Design a protein around this ligand. Structure first.
Ligand SMILES: CCCCCCCC/C=C\CCCCCCCC(=O)OC[C@H](COP(=O)(O)OCCN)OC(=O)CCCCCCC/C=C\CCCCCCCC
Ligand SMILES: CCCCCCCCO[C@@H]1O[C@H](CO)[C@@H](O)[C@H](O)[C@H]1O
Ligand SMILES: CCCCCCCCO[C@@H]1O[C@H](CO)[C@@H](O)[C@H](O)[C@H]1O
Lengths: 61, 112, 101, 48
């Protein structure tokens, strides 16, 4: 049972609860950003500089 | 059937409260407890030792402010209650580990 | 005829405090006269008023009302405080008048 | 007129998701705590 394990290991002792929030945040950020940026760029294919950049990026004059 | 001892259906414990208020009563009584293990469990030995550390008090204890029980000392120093007791009431399959105290309306909060 | 009575009974139901189980007098704003009046109420009337009110606040925090059956009926609304409140105001006006003379 | 345009919108996406998430979470917590008063029951027991 994850809930019980989670409770015993993470949420019971206030010290571990804080550690879970911090470590939880560090991991949430990394994931959340990559995901949102991922969604944003897909919803905007070929419109961002990232996308068209190659045309003038060492391929002109 | 006649010589078999019946096993009783288990009793579910519930974290909850019941408040019977009557401001016309001189002192307030408060009891708080968590579920205990029940007769057979060895822990009951430790629980009782625990209750011994906290102990009990009542305005007629002469030890007063020097009583070893921290709660007792505090109750004295700050006039926290008329009395208080710890208990570990056991039952076959369950029990009640808690404490009960008697205080004046305006010191219930600090005592608790 | 029974016009004033049709109106009153109407407003009474329009008001809606009866849905909380409160008497008209339970809804009074507690200014100075009302406070004195309340101190004169007999213990039983006072404790009943207190429960009705506590009950109302609990219904209010829950965003509920009483079942239609429990609603106070216009004609069964007991004006338990009006008598005291009138005397308190009578006494006050006497003093005010007298202290002027 | 507004070079921030794209960044601003990218930020709006994150704001909404975190907003959706955080609001639900806080709704549950508010409800969890109040549950005590929401379900509370009382009775008037005079020595009548
Ligand atoms: C990359 C990022 C990583 C680094 C970030 C570090 C931040 C970590 C902070 C330390 C961890 C917190 C520890 C909390 C421990 C205290 C506690 O009891 O929990 C909080 C306690 C919960 O009570 P219980 O459920 O009964 O918990 C009992 C535990 N057995 O109180 C709470 O509800 C607090 C949590 C809710 C937060 C609400 C905030 C709402 C705000 C939103 C708006 C946005 C923010 C903008 C900030 C403005 C700055 C200018
Ligand atoms: C200017 O560039 C901006 O940089 C930001 C990062 O700081 C990105 O999130 C925006 O999408 C991008 O347009
Ligand atoms: C209700 C709480 C809302 C908080 C939303 C936090 C989201 C802010 O996220 C922002 O996104 C930008 C675009 O990728 C980045 O350039 C910023 O550095 C980043 O802080």
């Amino acid at each position: 049972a994850l809930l019980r394990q989670a409770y015993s290991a993470l949420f019971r002792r206030t010290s571990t609860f804080a550690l879970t929030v911090v470590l939880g945040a560090v991991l949430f950020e990394r994931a959340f950003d990559q995901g949102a940026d991922a969604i944003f760029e897909h919803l905007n294919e070929g419109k961002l500089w990232k996308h068209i950049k190659h045309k003038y990026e060492a391929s002109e004059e | 059937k006649e010589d078999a001892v019946p096993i009783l259906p288990r009793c579910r414990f519930t974290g909850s409260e019941i408040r019977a208020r009557d401001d016309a009563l001189p002192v307030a009584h408060v009891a708080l407890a968590v579920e205990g293990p029940g007769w057979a469990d060895p822990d009951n030995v430790v629980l009782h030792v625990a209750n011994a550390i906290i102990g009990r008090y009542d305005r007629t204890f002469g030890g007063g402010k020097h009583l070893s029980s921290r709660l007792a000392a505090l109750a004295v120093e700050h006039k926290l209650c008329h009395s208080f007791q710890t208990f570990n009431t056991s039952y076959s399959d369950t029990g009640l580990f808690g404490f009960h105290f008697v205080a004046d309306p305006l010191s219930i909060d600090d005592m608790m | 005829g029974r016009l004033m009575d049709r109106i009153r009974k109407w407003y009474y139901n329009a008001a809606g405090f009866n849905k909380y189980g409160l008497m008209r007098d339970d809804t009074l704003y507690e200014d100075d006269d009302v406070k004195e009046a309340l101190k004169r109420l007999p213990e039983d009337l006072y404790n009943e008023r207190m429960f009705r009110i506590k009950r109302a606040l609990d219904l209010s925090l829950k965003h509920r009302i009483l079942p239609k059956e429990q609603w106070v009926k216009y004609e069964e609304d007991k004006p338990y405080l009006e008598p005291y409140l009138k005397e308190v105001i009578r006494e006050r006006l006497e003093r005010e008048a007298w202290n002027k003379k | 007129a507004e070079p921030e345009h794209d960044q601003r919108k990218r930020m709006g996406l994150k704001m909404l998701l975190i907003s959706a998430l955080l609001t639900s979470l806080l709704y549950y917590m508010k409800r969890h705590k109040w549950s005590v008063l929401k379900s509370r029951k009382m009775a008037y027991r005079p020595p009548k």
